[PDB]
Amino acid sequence: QANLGRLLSRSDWGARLPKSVEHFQGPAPYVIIHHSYMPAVCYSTPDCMKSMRDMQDFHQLERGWNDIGFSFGIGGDGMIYTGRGFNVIGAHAPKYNDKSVGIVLIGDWRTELPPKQMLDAAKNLIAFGVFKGYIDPAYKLLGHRQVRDTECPGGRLFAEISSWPHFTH
Ligand SMILES: [Zn+2]
């Protein structure tokens, strides 16, 4: 249990300040998909904002990290939540934190498929990142489980992203 004990800004969802921020240069060559597992899927915007605060609190206060570990969160409201954001060194996938966008789809996606507004938000965030130059045009799309011993992002979500553009073995 790693994460619990339109594009919204960190201030939109009530984020605490990061303890510290480290940047990396250049478009990210990797996009790494996660699920939260806990907390659960969130359908209202205020519930998704609370999930982002709860994950941030677990990461900062219990794991002692600088900030929520992920670059971005996706809610069941179909909104994108800024975590550390583009070109900020993450805390979601060791050896890939300084070279990836880590996207968490809030919820447990081991057996259930995220609803379509969540899959669309994640695809749109990546396309946006590519267009604006934050994500390398030859990026590789991975699930967390491809680079670390974990079930993340869940079997069902991992099978879904296996079908997406730039999915890489
Ligand atoms: Zn993960």
Name residues with Cβ closer than 5 Å to ligand 1, which is an ion: 34, 144, 152
For ligand 1, the distance from its centroid to the CA atom of residue 129, given in whole angstroms, is 20
- Does 23 carry a binding-site annotation? no
For ligand 1, the distance from its centroid to the CA atom of residue 154, given in whole angstroms, is 9
In whole angstroms, give the CA distance from residue 77 to residue 93: 25
In whole angstroms, give the CA distance from residue 162 to residue 158: 6
For ligand 1, the distance from its centroid to the CA atom of residue 72, given in whole angstroms, is 12
For ligand 1, the distance from its centroid to the CA atom of residue 33, given in whole angstroms, is 7
In whole angstroms, give the CA distance from residue 155 to residue 46: 28
For ligand 1, the distance from its centroid to the CA atom of residue 24, given in whole angstroms, is 20
Strands 7-8 and 135-143: unpaired
Query: In what side-by-side order are the strands of the sheet with 7-8?
Result: 7-8, 80-82, 72-74, 100-105, 28-35, 135-143
Apex CA 153: angle with CA 152 and CA 157, to 5°? Answer: 145
Spell out the SS3 assignment of 83-119: CCCCCECCCCCCCCCCCEEEEEECCCCCCCCCCHHHH
For ligand 1, the distance from its centroid to the CA atom of residue 152, given in whole angstroms, is 5
In whole angstroms, give the CA distance from residue 23 to residue 14: 22
Task: Give the CATH architecture of domain 7-11+27-161.
Answer: 3-Layer(aba) Sandwich (3.40)
- Does 144 carry a binding-site annotation? yes
